[PDB]
Subunit: 440 residues, 4 copies
């Protein structure tokens, strides 16, 4: 039919039809997705050239246009809604048409399908770009952001190694701990988060390229996949990219995204705990716990709120990803654009809020040392450290009398006239010292 | 060009000011800000508040008119690009509240009127009762003015097909296996009811979705606001918008300590997403083929035909389900006098409303309306199914009925032709008695 | 062990049930008492109607009704061994009920055919979802709503008792202007009251029964009015007026959207309960290192290592129940979306989850009301002291001494740990623009909470 | 019919025959919520842990040898399943699992008393322990054992059944399906190789979570600090557990505070199970669709009758349950505070159920569905040979327009592409039979 296309638009007919067919969310591909589609087209053009299937002049043109796209020079040339044909074929064609128009600016005539989509199908390209984008997000961005947060938490764990305070279990007063020990716990949660992301990489980095329409590789060179992956690894430095173990699994399912989402969700769960504890420690200053002071951006914990909200989003996104993941049929899972949107957003949210959390909250925390000490000196104590001085039986009697008369262990020892040759006052304070009780 | 404020650097053509710019620098998290409906509702709210402060003599009429004019521009969508703050901001949404106050002041300034963002545009209000008020305004309007009419359009399209296909007999399917006859019209009457029930579900949540916190100020007590600020602002909002569903909260503390009304409404959207998944799935399966699939109907071409709108629908449904999980999560985790997950909740609920509205109209117009049934083929299959030999039992015994069914399937013939081919027509069974027993439309029991 | 297939001797079920037992050894958990009861109610009403329409012999119908009444009464809850994770229509549990009823009638000398007699006018597809919705409707009206009303009433009572118990508000977990403990609990009460409203609003669709639609929704091989007749009997016998024939017989079998809808209501209540329970254990936190606003009744020892430590175990039970309801809700929506054509085949899993959510919420709400809320005591003097020392209450001084001096009062009081009243005095601001009488009027914290 | 018992809170009436005591009975009355208690595997883990603890306490000279022996013997009876009816406490108990810990202590004491040995539930049976490190330890022992000894071998059985079908059906060519629409040829073998990979990847996912799932909190006592335990109590107890269970995946926690303030390892493991549920949903759905009919469906295969696809229905319902449980687990996981996460019994219920359901349904799926599948081989090939999707390799010979006409006529007349090309008289000018049979070899097209 007749198709009206904007003057300064590098996309063509089929992209414009897709724009008209899916006015649903008003939001299109992110920069990372666009970049990954550009990287893939350049790599495909390179391999088609190396195999003598594509004329060198045409290949050079594609590679040049693809490089512009991957460098972010055309992020306004991808107007198709996220909620499109579930294979992502519309965005694939979007990329083919934009490259064709760019090449035409350089006096080379490309056919979007026959040249720019050579050896590819409408079904193995978009999930490939999706996993490229997800792997890049995991390796180049999320993991270093998490490492930064870990290092900030670990720094406080060391700095506060002897800042004694009261433990809390069930929200109730418990035996002493140090602020440093608590932050050593938070740091380990983030460290384990990094371990979780790393563990999913062998399957997250699997690319479907080469499988063409249904996974068989019909109408592609037998080694298209492995050659394209090699160019991608060389150009991105992403050694985690690899050919799929099974070309049918790689298109019929998107289980790699579901798996990876689970790692992000676990991280969201840890971050909720860490953020929650931190805003509670900062609460008050009169009606709260008043354990620490957060940097001001009466200070509201705005970054913990940002963190806990991001975590909520990752959990919602995770549910959406799994839902689409389960609902593939036969040779193709047709939930890819929705799954891509959600997994890449979860990566982006976690990355950016972890860095903000680290730099503008954690690094600048100040402990209220004297208040914390007074809290520790209000914790329950135990009789065990008195055994080698008064014996198991007298200790047991002290514990019973303390419980009965609702007095501290220390005062009960004094009231029972136990301060003598077997136990001086100094010896009592040493054995019951709250920092020693924390076993730091 | 960038103008300077105090020190913070603000874009020249930006109508926001220093507090918004600081929020921009503090939350570079998603790169996504408030949606159009939330911005519109913030405008609506600020205008109504100014009207009431003017009515109560608390704000100069010249200042009030400036806010009202500015706010109207915002509510009309003229300033959507003036709200740069990330969704993932302070959990009260105070940053976006100040964004609105600042943009209104800057709009007024161009008209020669000076407004203090806090002292004037935020008069009688707090950082805590305004943003969720705007959220519930935006959600109520999305439910009443957009989603319900969209759903009604879908219902009517499905109902129209159910009528057109009233006598289009086909094989029923249970457990995906062949079963006794139904009509395509009956199936589509079921789809229509699912959507109709969806509308009932949305309507049922409105008494609580429409509750507004405005007037409760910082903690719910209404301290530093007129005692009747809430009912006055709501009456102005209703008067201006026609949204009679908007109401003052039943309890002012519940309305700020929790966002339970959004959790409730999301559940209604989630159920609709569940209904749409079933409908969309059946339709793309019915259209599967053209050779190795079910080949019951043909879908209209768009991009044989891929079912691209059922894929759009089932992907939207997945998103609504994910959004629903995030909303419940934020909803459960308020503390004492304030739930601090509102911007995240607003984002997700308003998007869910939008996606369902837009994809339902698309589904109705560009998929449902142009569906075409393979009528003769559907009847042929129904008339050849082993599932329909049971009315033959009283005439020929279930053992011979079984032989008929097995031979019909093997030779790919109707049950009728098989009965005839096996020489069963006689005094035990006339051809007219056979056609009565095997009347597959009558078996469907269409009203 | 009798033989038919080896079947336990004291088993009232027969061969088809025993086959299902051997086919689905998956969870080791079978139907609940409420589902069993509902299957009993339905079979008895069906025989009643079949008899009335002259389709079933009176002696046979009487034997079904008598046997089905024993099942509904809970006398045979050990005769339903089939796993929850069975054929997705629930046909196996339907046959279970048919077989057990036939065996009961056999003890009385009457021979019933499980299919031809007990399952007359019914199919293996409209029975189990009918029983599920009967069970879910009963759980909503007879058990959950009264239990929520009991918790509502306990919260409302506390709100009344604590109407003048002033304290500092908390927003973002930071100090805020005064509220009363009573206002907060009126807020919790409203959340529970709204929860009841949410359950009530789903009942028009939760109560829809598929019975009469037979195999595919068409009503083939059943009387045309079978559905309305069975429902009439059920409503008369159970008093459950919310039970009704489905608006659309195809929707009622192709989907279980009413269950998804109802779970949404339950999920929302779980969300409310989470907020309420969290606030309450935080309010009782400490007693020396926490908020120490209230004291929860002691229910059991908390720690071996810490002998006097008593933990908020009911709020912990409530919040864990809430997590379960949210999990169950996701399972129900998952099952609900994935029907195909004429039948949703996730009914037993959806039934398990919705009925569990009803049960857990019902039971934990009553325990929460009786063993926690009713016995709460407020630390009134503690709460009032913090309120009277709060920087947040200096605002009403503005019109007398100016906001800059009020800010100074707040800073000094906060630093010298004094009340706002005493700090105003210690700065010598009581003169001819401000009496001690006017000061106490302006710093009346209860009046600042504006309690009605 | 009762006897009097007591704790630090006062006196409590207990059923006369019951092996539990006061604190258990308080919890019986405090939490009548679900009506369901700990599972066999949980009780076993608690028994194993208590025995190991008594062994270490005896080794370190902290507990009298005659007392340790009485504990170890009692704990063995519990771990073997002789006293499961003595664990009446609801899943929905105190969030630390305090009550079930005391349950185990009390029952061990009452058992030993029958042997003439007097044990204090707290002082002897709970020596060097607290609830806060024992109940999550038992929970992670149960989950680790469920992963290693049960789930992975069940998945390997399912993988092997799917891989056997992939081998058997290696040349069973059929029409591909994308968007539910006919596509270029594949084989049943290839589809099933895809299913096998999903389950193989599932095993990889479970194995990848084990370094953290296997972490045990034991030794951290009340708040993570180890107060009131020997400094090496944890490593010693873990060594005993590893020796007695053969589970090398059991290990001390990398950080003692993380191990009690959080249950992130359970959230992580649930993610793997959830992913498996997602894979199983795809496989089960495909298989019931392939078996659909016998007239109006796809009718690609026939499922064994045990014909409704009842095992795929059991599989997809189990999947839904696992996804549901997964949401409950993450919810509890996120909501710890300071030194302790208090959602452990609920998280344990859900993670352990998810392990159990996937284990049992995978073995059933493998044995009683996958193994007995039969393919309609000739019919599949005939459809593949008759599909408009395979006319494309004729384009260069007969042209686009004629290829479309061939496709349309073949469908309308229900004939193969090969026969339609012949019938339209295209052999001779356009191409030979040899060329036709080469271009339309659907098996070669499937690249198999
Ligand atoms: C999706 O399903 C189809 C797609 C296309 C065509 S066709 O009309 O194009 N066709 C019929 C002409 C004889 C050559 C086979 C191809 C037919 C069917 N369906 C059937 O053939 C049903 C059937 N009937 N009888 C049997 O014995 C049987 C045995 C195994 C599998 C299926 C069947
Ligand atoms: C599930 O799908 C089937 C089930 C059973 C049988 S059967 O083998 O039992 N059969 C074929 C013999 C002629 C009488 C129809 C019944 C066939 C099909 N499939 C087809 O007939 C495919 C088909 N082929 N060609 C067309 O032109 C057409 C037009 C509309 C719809 C479908 C088609
Ligand atoms: Cl443009
Ligand atoms: Cl701008
Ligand atoms: Cl029995
Ligand atoms: Cl039972
Ligand atoms: Cl009614």
């Amino acid at each position: 039919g007749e198709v009206r296309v904007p003057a300064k638009a590098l996309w063509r007919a089929q992209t414009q039809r897709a724009v008209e067919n899916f006015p649903i969310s008003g939001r299109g591909l992110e920069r990372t997705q666009i970049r990954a589609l550009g990287l893939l087209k350049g790599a495909c053009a390179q391999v088609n050239s190396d195999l003598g299937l594509l004329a060198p002049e045409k290949a050079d043109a594609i590679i040049a246009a693809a490089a512009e796209i991957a460098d972010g020079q055309h992020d306004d040339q991808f107007p198709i809604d996220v909620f499109q044909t579930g294979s992502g074929t519309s965005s694939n064609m979007n990329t083919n048409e934009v490259i064709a128009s760019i090449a035409a600016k350089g006096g080379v005539t490309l056919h979007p399908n026959d040249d720019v989509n050579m050896s590819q199908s409408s079904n193995d390209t978009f999930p490939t770009a999706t996993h490229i984008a997800a792997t890049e997000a995991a390796v180049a961005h999320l993991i270093p952001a998490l490492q930064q947060l870990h290092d900030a938490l670990a720094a406080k764990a060391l700095d506060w190694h002897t800042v004694v305070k009261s433990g809390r279990t069930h929200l109730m007063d418990a035996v002493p701990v140090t602020l440093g020990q608590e932050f050593s716990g938070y740091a380990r949660q983030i460290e384990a988060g990094i371990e979780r992301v790393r563990a999913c990489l062998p399957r997250l980095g699997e690319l479907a390229i080469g499988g063409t329409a249904v996974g068989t590789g019909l109408n592609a060179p037998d080694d298209f996949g492995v050659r394209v992956v090699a160019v991608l690894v060389a150009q991105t430095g992403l050694s985690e990219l690899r050919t799929a173990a099974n070309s049918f699994e790689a298109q019929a399912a998107r289980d790699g995204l579901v798996e990876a989402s689970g790692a992000l969700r676990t991280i969201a769960v840890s971050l909720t705990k860490i953020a929650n504890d931190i805003r509670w420690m900062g609460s008050g200053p009169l009606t709260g716990l008043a354990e620490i002071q957060l940097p001001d951006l009466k200070v509201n914990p705005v970054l913990p709120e940002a963190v806990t909200q991001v975590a909520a989003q990752v959990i919602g996104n995770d549910a959406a990803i799994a839902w689409g993941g389960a609902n593939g049929a036969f040779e193709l899972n047709v939930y890819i654009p929705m799954m891509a949107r959600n997994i890449l957003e979860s990566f982006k949210l976690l990355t950016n809020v972890s860095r903000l959390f680290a730099q503008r909250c954690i690094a600048g925390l100040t402990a209220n040392v004297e208040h914390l000490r007074r809290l520790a000196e209000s914790s329950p104590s135990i009789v065990t450290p008195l055994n080698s001085a008064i014996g198991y039986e007298e200790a047991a009697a002290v514990a019973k009398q303390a419980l009965k008369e609702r007095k501290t262990i220390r005062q009960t020892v004094i009231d029972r006239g136990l301060i003598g040759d077997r136990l001086s006052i100094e010896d009592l304070d040493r054995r019951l010292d709250v920092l020693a009780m924390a076993k730091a």
